[PDB]
């Protein structure tokens with residue numbers, strides 16, 4: 465699907481058997497999700513954005529179905545105000561910017 | 564132009580007679596630029612991100628030439644780590660996400 469940007473590009477994702485809505489973010493290099501419970505072992509990490517830095521838990525090789533498109537990659541879980549789909553997963557489902 | 568997301572979607576912008584590089588950010592509702600001077604009267608505002616919040620100066624009806632595509636809209640200037648082109652200006656240049 466082609467997505468115009470007159471509204472926030474929110475899509476429905478399926479991660480760990482849970483349904484959530486996430487923001488297709490071309491300005492994000494990696495995926496960051498709000499607090500949730502994810503299987504497996506994680507490693508602590510600190511990511512930076514506007515306003516400073518937050519502590520997140522890095523989960524590797526996590527499957528996500530983004531708007532019916534499957535992808536596996538690293539997912540960061542932490543106090544993000546909004547669920548974000550970063551470029552690490554956008555490239556797997558073949559997303560492009562066109563103008 | 565079609566832009567893949569394997570690298571940061573950076574574009575050359577022309578704003579206030581100055582040349583800068585900015586990130587086409589679909590995850591940003593507003594355009595946020597590092598410190599500079601623009602015309603007209605401004606009003607203070609505070610915007611939030613992953614790490615918290617930063618104080619910005621809201622400038623309205625500001626012209627920006629993004630990769631040769633002109634657009635006028637609100638531009639926020641403040642201590643952002645990276646120049647961000649938000650959806651307020653992406654819609655003006657006809658930007659879409661495609662997968």
Ligand SMILES: CC[C@H](C)CN(C[C@@H](O)[C@H](Cc1cc(F)cc(F)c1)NC(=O)O[C@H]1CO[C@H]2OCC[C@H]21)S(=O)(=O)c1ccc([C@H](C)O)cc1
Pocket residue numbers: 489490491492493494495496511512513514540544545546548550588589590591592593594595610611612613614644645649
């Ligand atoms: C350094 C370049 C960018 C600042 C990186 N960011 C992506 C941006 O798209 C971000 C998305 C966003 C949307 C949102 F609603 C809440 C929120 F907290 C974050 N936009 C943003 O801050 O927008 C501002 C301005 O407009 C306003 O509207 C919405 C909020 C305000 S990031 O999220 O910091 C980030 C993500 C992933 C990684 C991985 C580890 O690589 C690192 C860093």
